[PDB]
Scaffold this active site. Structure first.
Site, PDB file in Angstrom:
ATOM      1  N   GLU B  12      11.914  38.520  13.724  1.00 47.11           N
ATOM      2  CA  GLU B  12      10.997  37.486  14.219  1.00 47.11           C
ATOM      3  C   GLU B  12      11.557  36.656  15.121  1.00 47.11           C
ATOM      4  O   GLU B  12      10.981  36.313  16.282  1.00 47.11           O
ATOM      5  CB  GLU B  12      10.589  36.745  12.813  1.00 47.11           C
ATOM      6  CG  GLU B  12      10.039  35.100  13.407  1.00 47.11           C
ATOM      7  CD  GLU B  12       9.903  34.492  12.106  1.00 47.11           C
ATOM      8  OE1 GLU B  12      10.047  33.242  12.486  1.00 47.11           O
ATOM      9  OE2 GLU B  12       9.775  34.874  10.961  1.00 47.11           O
ATOM     10  N   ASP B 197       9.423  41.137  -2.699  1.00 43.27           N
ATOM     11  CA  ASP B 197       9.443  41.818  -4.125  1.00 43.27           C
ATOM     12  C   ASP B 197       9.279  40.759  -5.223  1.00 43.27           C
ATOM     13  O   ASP B 197       9.516  39.717  -5.021  1.00 43.27           O
ATOM     14  CB  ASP B 197      10.781  42.473  -4.362  1.00 43.27           C
ATOM     15  CG  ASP B 197      11.940  41.845  -4.213  1.00 43.27           C
ATOM     16  OD1 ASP B 197      12.272  40.869  -4.982  1.00 43.27           O
ATOM     17  OD2 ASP B 197      12.374  41.747  -3.104  1.00 43.27           O
TER      18      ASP B 197
END
Lengths: 232, 232
Positions: B12, B197
């Site tokens: 990013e 997750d």
């Protein structure tokens, strides 16, 4: 040579600040840094905050803004070794976080990615500190100091630290963060901590009474160490 | 208006850096800060290190040196709430350390002396982030993010966090340190984290595959948020 001084004990910082000549006060990120000369030696003085991030914030501002050649970091700590006595002065050979854990990724316990598992104090600064401490009739004990944001004062937390760091002799909340910042700026440092209490032993002095004595002793030790590192 | 951007995801940061016009690179304390304009808006971009101190060090350098008006902090985190799905975007209403404890002195668990027990993201930055996230067809979940230097991936550590922070929905290693620094500089911030997750749930994607998708999505979200905060 410019010497950076970061102290945890409020009274020590005040005592040292009042001794600074040509004193200037820098206010940044909520911190105050005092600069000037201590007996002719250029110094940059800061009182460390509580906890890893607060200490790192201040240490980063001091290093970036003042660019000292070395750092002396003082304060108090709980003693982990039974042979320690209240009032002993622990001198760090290294500092490690007792609450960092990325072992799941292969790193050593206490180590964070990109850093040494333990941050090493400078050999020469250590030697100088020990000479100054002994000269003041204080007892220096060289060893590992561990830091964490959880204050340790129970059997469980104590047991965990001794399990993870059998060689740790003192514990507090800022030393490793300051060593870590110094490491990132490639600045030699030495960490010193007066022992306020010893694990599994009832302390006779209250923290306040300990501090009244240790802060004064520590300011003199720093003044002596600054001189020693300046003119041998 | 100058917008500070601190991101955990390497891809990013690279994607955003390549979009910066009139780019300059500041190298300090082992960190690199990219400044210039992102679609005409002044920005200061930094990749956060791992752990509280490393993140604090970089955030302090960015704030002191660049003096942005607001901070956008991005990255990934483990989801604690069972209802979360991989790929959800948690938007912080507040950030707390899960490993700070000076409760023995009367402070709230997670709180350090001199700080609020929880660092609060700015209402307007939160609203703007949520609008940008929804506009990109992503799912924003507002809630508490907790940070600590011990990576969480076991039943015991997980249980401890849920006990201490029943309302925590995401956990990672840098958000609170960055919020803490912003707080000390009195700079409004917003923390955003893509969920990689979910606790007690087998993840289908590997961290690498998650990152390849989330880092790209996050860079676009940031570009949109920068624009939104600049011109509504």
């Amino acid at each position: 040579m410019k010497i950076g001084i970061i102290g945890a004990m409020e009274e020590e910082v005040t005592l040292l600040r009042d001794k600074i000549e040509n004193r200037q006060t820098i206010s940044l990120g909520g911190c105050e840094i005092y600069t000037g000369q201590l007996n002719g030696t250029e110094v940059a003085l800061l009182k460390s905050g509580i906890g890893k991030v607060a200490a790192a914030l201040g240490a980063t501002l001091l290093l970036e803004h003042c660019k000292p050649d070395v750092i002396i970091n003082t304060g108090s700590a709980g003693g982990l070794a039974p042979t320690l006595k209240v009032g002993d002065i622990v001198v760090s050979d290294e500092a490690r976080y007792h609450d960092a854990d990325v072992t799941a990724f292969g790193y050593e316990y206490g180590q964070l990615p990109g850093c040494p598992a333990g941050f090493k104090a400078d050999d020469k600064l250590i030697a100088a500190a020990e000479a100054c401490i002994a000269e003041l009739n204080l007892n220096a004990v060289r060893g590992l100091i561990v830091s964490g944001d959880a204050f340790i004062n129970g059997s469980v937390g104590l047991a965990k630290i001794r399990h993870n760091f059998p060689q740790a002799i003192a514990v507090e909340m800022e030393a490793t963060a300051i060593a870590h910042v110094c490491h990132n700026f490639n600045v030699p440092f030495v960490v010193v901590r007066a022992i306020s209490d010893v694990a599994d032993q009832q302390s006779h002095l209250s923290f306040d009474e300990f501090l009244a004595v240790a802060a004064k002793q520590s300011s003199l030790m720093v003044e002596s160490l600054v001189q020693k590192l300046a003119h041998g």
